[PDB]
Amino acid sequence: QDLEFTRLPNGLVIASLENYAPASRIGLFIKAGSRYEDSNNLGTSHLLRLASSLTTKGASSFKITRGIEAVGGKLSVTSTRESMAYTVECLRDDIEILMEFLLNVTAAPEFRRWEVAALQSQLRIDKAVAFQNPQAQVLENLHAAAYRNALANSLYCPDYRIGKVTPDQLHYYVQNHFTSARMALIGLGVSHPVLKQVAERFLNMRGGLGLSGAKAKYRGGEIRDQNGDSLVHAALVAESAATGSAEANAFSVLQHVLGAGPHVKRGSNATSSLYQAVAKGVHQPFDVSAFNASYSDSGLFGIYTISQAASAGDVIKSAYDQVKTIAQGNLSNTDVQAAKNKLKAGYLMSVESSEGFLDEVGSQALVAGSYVQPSTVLQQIDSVADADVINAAKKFVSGRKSMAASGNLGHTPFVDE
Amino acid sequence: PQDLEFTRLPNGLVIASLENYAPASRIGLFIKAGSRYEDSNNLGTSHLLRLASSLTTKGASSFKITRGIEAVGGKLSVTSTRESMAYTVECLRDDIEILMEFLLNVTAAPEFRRWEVAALQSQLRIDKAVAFQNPQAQVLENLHAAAYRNALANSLYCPDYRIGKVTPDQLHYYVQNHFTSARMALIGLGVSHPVLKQVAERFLNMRGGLGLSGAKAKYRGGEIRDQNGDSLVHAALVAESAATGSAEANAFSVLQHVLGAGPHVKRGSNATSSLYQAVAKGVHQPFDVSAFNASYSDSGLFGIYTISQAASAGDVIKSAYDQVKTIAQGNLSNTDVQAAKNKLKAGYLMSVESSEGFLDEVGSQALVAGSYVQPSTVLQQIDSVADADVINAAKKFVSGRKSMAASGNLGHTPFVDE
Amino acid sequence: WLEGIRKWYYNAAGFNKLGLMRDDTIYEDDDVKEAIRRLPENLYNDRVFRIKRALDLTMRQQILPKEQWTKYEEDKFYLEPYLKEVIRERKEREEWAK
Amino acid sequence: RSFLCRESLSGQAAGRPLVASVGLNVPASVR
Amino acid sequence: AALPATSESPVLDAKRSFLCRESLSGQAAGRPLVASVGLNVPASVRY
Numbered sequence A: 001q002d003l004e005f006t007r008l009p010n011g012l013v014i015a016s017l018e019n020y021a022p023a024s025r026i027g028l029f030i031k032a033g034s035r036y037e038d039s040n041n042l043g044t045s046h047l048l049r050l051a052s053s054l055t056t057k058g059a060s061s062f063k064i065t066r067g068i069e070a071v072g073g074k075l076s077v078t079s080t081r082e083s084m085a086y087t088v089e090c091l092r093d094d095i096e097i098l099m100e101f102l103l104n105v106t107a108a109p110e111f112r113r114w115e116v117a118a119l120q121s122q123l124r125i126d127k128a129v130a131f132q133n134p135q136a137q138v139l140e141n142l143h144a145a146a147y148r149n150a151l152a153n154s155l156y157c158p159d160y161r162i163g164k165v166t167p168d169q170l171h172y173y174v175q176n177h178f179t180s181a182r183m184a185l186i187g188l189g190v191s192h193p194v195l196k197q198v199a200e201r202f203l204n205m206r207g208g209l210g211l212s213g214a215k216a217k218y219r220g221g222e223i224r225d226q227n228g229d230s231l232v233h234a235a236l237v238a239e240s241a242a243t244g245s246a247e248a249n250a251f252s253v254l255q256h257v258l259g260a261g262p263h264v265k266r267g268s269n270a271t272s273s274l275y276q277a278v279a280k281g282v283h284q285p286f287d288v289s290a291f292n293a294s295y296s297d298s299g300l301f302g303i304y305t306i307s308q309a310a311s312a313g314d315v316i317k318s319a320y321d322q323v324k325t326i327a328q329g330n331l332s333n334t335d336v337q338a339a340k341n342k343l344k345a346g347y348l349m350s351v352e353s354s355e356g357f358l359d360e361v362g363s364q365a366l367v368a369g370s371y372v373q374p375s376t377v378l379q380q381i382d383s384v385a386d387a388d389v390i391n392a393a394k395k396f397v398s399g400r401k402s403m404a405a406s407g408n409l410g411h412t413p414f415v416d417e
Numbered sequence B: 001p002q003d004l005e006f007t008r009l010p011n012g013l014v015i016a017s018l019e020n021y022a023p024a025s026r027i028g029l030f031i032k033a034g035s036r037y038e039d040s041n042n043l044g045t046s047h048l049l050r051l052a053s054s055l056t057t058k059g060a061s062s063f064k065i066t067r068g069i070e071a072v073g074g075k076l077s078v079t080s081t082r083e084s085m086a087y088t089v090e091c092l093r094d095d096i097e098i099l100m101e102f103l104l105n106v107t108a109a110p111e112f113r114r115w116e117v118a119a120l121q122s123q124l125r126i127d128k129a130v131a132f133q134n135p136q137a138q139v140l141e142n143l144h145a146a147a148y149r150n151a152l153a154n155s156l157y158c159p160d161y162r163i164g165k166v167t168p169d170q171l172h173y174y175v176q177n178h179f180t181s182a183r184m185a186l187i188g189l190g191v192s193h194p195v196l197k198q199v200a201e202r203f204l205n206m207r208g209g210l211g212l213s214g215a216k217a218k219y220r221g222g223e224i225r226d227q228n229g230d231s232l233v234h235a236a237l238v239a240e241s242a243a244t245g246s247a248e249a250n251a252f253s254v255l256q257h258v259l260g261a262g263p264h265v266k267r268g269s270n271a272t273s274s275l276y277q278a279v280a281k282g283v284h285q286p287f288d289v290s291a292f293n294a295s296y297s298d299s300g301l302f303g304i305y306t307i308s309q310a311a312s313a314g315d316v317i318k319s320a321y322d323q324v325k326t327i328a329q330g331n332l333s334n335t336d337v338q339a340a341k342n343k344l345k346a347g348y349l350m351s352v353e354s355s356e357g358f359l360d361e362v363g364s365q366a367l368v369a370g371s372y373v374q375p376s377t378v379l380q381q382i383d384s385v386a387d388a389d390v391i392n393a394a395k396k397f398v399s400g401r402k403s404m405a406a407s408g409n410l411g412h413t414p415f416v417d418e
Numbered sequence C: 001w002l003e004g005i006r007k008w009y010y011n012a013a014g015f016n017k018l019g020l021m022r023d024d025t026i027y028e029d030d031d032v033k034e035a036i037r038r039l040p041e042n043l044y045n046d047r048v049f050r051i052k053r054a055l056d057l058t059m060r061q062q063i064l065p066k067e068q069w070t071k072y073e074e075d076k077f078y079l080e081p082y083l084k085e086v087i088r089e090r091k092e093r094e095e096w097a098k
Numbered sequence D: 001r002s003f004l005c006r007e008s009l010s011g012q013a014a015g016r017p018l019v020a021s022v023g024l025n026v027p028a029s030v031r
Numbered sequence E: 001a002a003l004p005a006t007s008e009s010p011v012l013d014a015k016r017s018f019l020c021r022e023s024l025s026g027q028a029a030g031r032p033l034v035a036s037v038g039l040n041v042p043a044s045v046r047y
Helices: A044-050 A061-070 A095-107 A113-131 A134-146 A167-177 A192-205 A246-258 A273-279 A312-327 A333-350 A354-367 A374-382 A393-397 B045-051 B062-072 B096-108 B114-132 B135-147 B168-178 B193-202 B247-259 B274-280 B313-329 B334-352 B355-369 B375-383 B394-398 C002-013 C030-037 C041-060 C080-097
Strands: A003-007 A013-017 A023-030 A074-076 A084-091 A183-188 A234-240 A286-294 A299-307 A401-404 B005-008 B014-018 B024-031 B076-080 B085-092 B184-189 B223-226 B233-239 B288-295 B300-308 B403-407 E034-039 E041-046
Touching: A003 A192, A013 A192, A013 A354, A023 A095, A023 A354, A044 A084, A044 A113, A044 A167, A061 A095, A061 C080, A074 A095, A084 A095, A084 A354, A095 A192, A113 A134, A113 A167, A134 A234, A134 A299, A134 A401, A183 A192, A183 A354, A234 A246, A234 A286, A234 A312, A234 A393, A246 A273, A246 A286, A246 A299, A246 A312, A246 A333, A246 A374, A246 A393, A273 A286, A273 A312, A286 A312, A299 A312, A299 A401, A312 A393, A333 A354, A333 A374, B005 B193, B014 B193, B014 B355, B024 B096, B024 B355, B045 B076, B045 B085, B045 B114, B045 B168, B045 E034, B062 B085, B062 B096, B062 E034, B076 B096, B085 B096, B085 B355, B096 B193, B114 B135, B114 B168, B114 E034, B114 E041, B135 B223, B135 B233, B135 B300, B135 B403, B184 B193, B184 B355, B233 B288, B233 B313, B247 B274, B247 B288, B247 B300, B247 B313, B247 B334, B247 B375, B247 B394, B274 B288, B274 B313, B300 B313, B313 B394, B334 B355, B334 B375, C030 C080
Parallel strands: A013 A183, B014 B184, B223 B403
Antiparallel strands: A003 A013, A023 A084, A023 A183, A074 A084, A234 A299, A234 A401, A286 A299, B005 B014, B024 B085, B024 B184, B076 B085, B076 E034, B233 B300, B233 B403, B288 B300, E034 E041
16 A cells, blocks of 8 residues: 555665555656657657657557457556656456556557658647647747757758658667666556566666766757747746756745646635736736746746737836845745745646656656655745845856747847836 | 939938939839838738738829839839839829829828738749749858848848738838838939929828837848759858948948958959868869848858869868958958959949839848948048958957858758858 | 478469569459558669569560579568468458458 | 736736646647 | 849749858858849849
8 A cells, every 4th residue: 555666776766555446557658759869860769759659569569559458448658858758548357468568559659660650740749739738839949949959959850850760760769768777667556566567578678777868058049939829838947957956846836826727716826926027017828837847957937928919028027126126135934935835736646647646756766766755845845934035036046047938029128128 | 413312301201302404213112111120920021011012002004003003104113122212203204293103102191901012912922932942042041041130130031931911011011110101212313303392291191200120130140051953052151241331331341352252353363352262172063152241230241152073062162261261360452452442442433324223223232331431431441441451351250159051962062060 | 301392382382583572473462552651762663673673574575594593491471470360350240340 | 819808817827837748639739 | 024033933942052162152151141022023132
């Protein structure tokens, strides 16, 4: 009824928890993603993510699809910049079959020429569907402008690599960044012994740490594009601290001090200092929120903003001024307590869902290498003091900026101002 | 025989004509209505206006325009830069009157009918695709976007998000606010002044004022890098040099020709070009470096343009830059300065000899300077440039915000901060 | 011996005379078309050239000289590795429908 | 899907890094 | 244009390859781009 955290000699991390749930989910989390893509092989990670139903070494594509659907299971390949997460979910009496299927998919794929070439067309469709949300393009340009390399690579294939991602690139990516030392096998609703057996039965074929990536240099670019739509999705960020650090928790607290996301449906974000600061001023439809994205090497922290084309000048500026006020010791301990309560709730609330718990534990195994109970996370959050947030604001303010905008950029101010 | 006679009309128009008794005569209406005047809500309007010639005008239908222009076997070409469009007609000196009437109809009384513009809007994609087949177009557009903030940043071509949404009202507003009688120059080669004055009084009577004034193109210093995947990495690194028609502009041109600007002997070695020699001692692979000088009315951009292989690109960027730094501390041989001045004087004279080149030069002189200076004056101005000015020139380029645009497999291209 | 009769029949078949590789002579059903589509580019180009040249020769009713005939041991089986996989996939689909 | 009020725009300003996700039986999703 | 310029406009067509230092001579723009498209003349660009 607890969470075992065994680590194999290969470096594989087997974590399993027997919640006695009617359904079970098994997830393999790999230190692979756009951050490890080289310049020559850009877009390989996206194609691999789209490549989970192809003919494996011991299971054909038809067999994989029909077997997963016959038991009514689901197979997702949720991917980030620094992690790719395969996940199967099905009734706790059929987990073995889908577990074998996922183990074949991740460990021993074939990447046959005809299938890969035919599926290259799916890259464009998926990229277009993802980019139909302006946030996706803005965040991709944000990463491209902020980081020189590594994290700069987008999760989606660049238009010039659509149709040119050869199966050799996928094979090289698999044999390089899918080694045992950089994976973590997690199970919810499964027993630890069988997880260990299947792990040492499949994932043992490839060992070692694998191809190591490079650090993430922080240029500070200002990638701007004009998409015509009235709403101006701007985002101004700066270099935050790396995850699993005291300054990381300080920036996380600063995110809720500034205000991030709504809490009441069709609310007014009264506690959100950014929203209240911007509301005084622009009387036009808008939205402003703090933005935190902490990766392994480093991370980004700033403000995201949607506003009318003409009003964009004020909304970016006014919100920024608010952070300045926080920098010069204008943060009350009551707001600190409110932000800490919001953060504690958010953490205890994301792990509420079974999928959310699986993702949390998978990230913990991937990055830290040791699971941390929620109570310890709450204690760490409470350990943050006001001065740390006050720094945090200084480090955001007195640092090289990185701006990404979209829409009619006629009135959008440039990073220099 | 005859001279380039110049007369500025009371409206604001300047008519200059040169009767060279050539078998063919050309007429160019130069309008200070380039792409720098496009605001953020009408980008690409100037591009469509450039392709908007031959559309049905007020006095002549599109069919009539095409049939009349080509039955004589004439010309109707629109040459647009970042600051000034120029309509040009060419035919025999016997049929010049009809060509002038057609040009004045297409430049003074356009209709921009809804169906015509709707059909024409498809040609924007074709023009952009054809022009962008040359990577230099993409590189220069990115350079202008990443160097100038507001005015000159507008592309010569309609952005993909505006293709299909260029309303005829936008064209009418652009014409009414930029095609003004005080912003144009009707330049005639192979004609006589009285004839050009009659056509000036024929229609040529728009609002007559100075139109919608533009904005001072502020400098940005940004860096736009796109990864298109073609092996030949084109990179370009520039800094704000000076406005055109200034002493610093002449010094920057002399510096450009000192560094090297294009080849002279076909398939030679660019021995005189200091940049080529400096880079060649480094990378031993196919490359091409050249000083890139742009001189607009309000400001300018001096830098280096390097086509290089993907792996070697950084070295090509570094060593060439170092070469400029070598001049910055002062290593300019007076022989090199004299050679560059000779190259500049030549290039100018050999650009003027062509009838089309003469027409464009006189049009630019009329629009920007407002008068016309004989080639001897320009050669004397170039000769007046001293070495100390060419030395900054080099210091200003070295110490300034550097705007860089790159295209290709940018796996090793240095950034602006590097 | 069996291989002797196989070689004699290979000689008497006639498609060796037109420079035609064995797999070129197969009938093209849905499995065969899918297998041909699956071929790599070089193999596909060689196959199409061989077929076109053989069609020319049959139109003019001539065969290449003795030297440029495909031999028994030079007759590789290039379509077979893909055709067997296609057949296996079809059989798997039918067995799932079974 | 447009937006022309605060209530509709509320919750549209991303504050967490983008995480792409596509399944085999479930449609692709981003966040 | 009695004369059809020199190089026409093959849209959806590959450009002339490169791969020689001499053939890559002076391809580096030195003057601002200008475009010229008009009635009865192929479009051109000059830098």
